C-alpha cells in the first residue's frame, strides 16, 4: 500500500512525473513474491520442511 501511495504521488508532482515509475513497479513484484512465500510458509509449508516433496 505504501508503494501504491508513493507511485501515485510521484505521478502528480509539480514539474513532471517521477522517474522511478518502473523502479517502483519492480519493488511491487518483489514484495508480492515475498508475501506469497511467507503466506505459503505460514499456511503449512513450514511444518512440512523436513518432509520429502
Amino acid at each position: 500500500q505504501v508503494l501504491t501511495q508513493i507511485a501515485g504521488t510521484g505521478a502528480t508532482l509539480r514539474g513532471g512525473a517521477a522517474s522511478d515509475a518502473e523502479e517502483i513497479a519492480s519493488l511491487r513484484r518483489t514484495v508480492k513474491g515475498l508475501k506469497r512465500s511467507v503466506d505459503m510458509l505460514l499456511g503449512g509449508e513450514m511444518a512440512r520442511m523436513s518432509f520429502f516433496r
Partner: protein, 87 residues
C-alpha cells in the same frame, strides 16, 4: 477412557492406544475410528507404524461405527501428515 472423559491428555491417551495396538484387527479399527473422530513427530511415527501394520467381524464393527474402511484410514493418515507439515 478416563483421560478421554477428562489436549495433551488426549494425545497421551492416543499414544497409549497406539502402543496397545502394536502389542496386539478389531482393536486397530476402533483405534482408527477414534483417530478420525479426533481429527507431533511421535504421533506421526505412531500413525506410520499403524499404516505398516494394516475379517467379517471387523467389517461389521466398521459398518456399525459408520452408522472403504482402509481408504478412510489412508485419508485420515494423509490429513494427519498435512497437519504435521503445517505445524
Amino acid at each position: 477412557v478416563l483421560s478421554q472423559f477428562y489436549d495433551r491428555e488426549d494425545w497421551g491417551q492416543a499414544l497409549r492406544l497406539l502402543l496397545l495396538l502394536i502389542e496386539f484387527h478389531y482393536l486397530v479399527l476402533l483405534v482408527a475410528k477414534f483417530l478420525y473422530p479426533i481429527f507431533e513427530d511421535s504421533v506421526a511415527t505412531v500413525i506410520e507404524v499403524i499404516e505398516t501394520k494394516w475379517s467379517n467381524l471387523y467389517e461389521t464393527i466398521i459398518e456399525a461405527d459408520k452408522s472403504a474402511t482402509l481408504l478412510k484410514n489412508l485419508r485420515k493418515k494423509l490429513n494427519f501428515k498435512l497437519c504435521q507439515a503445517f505445524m
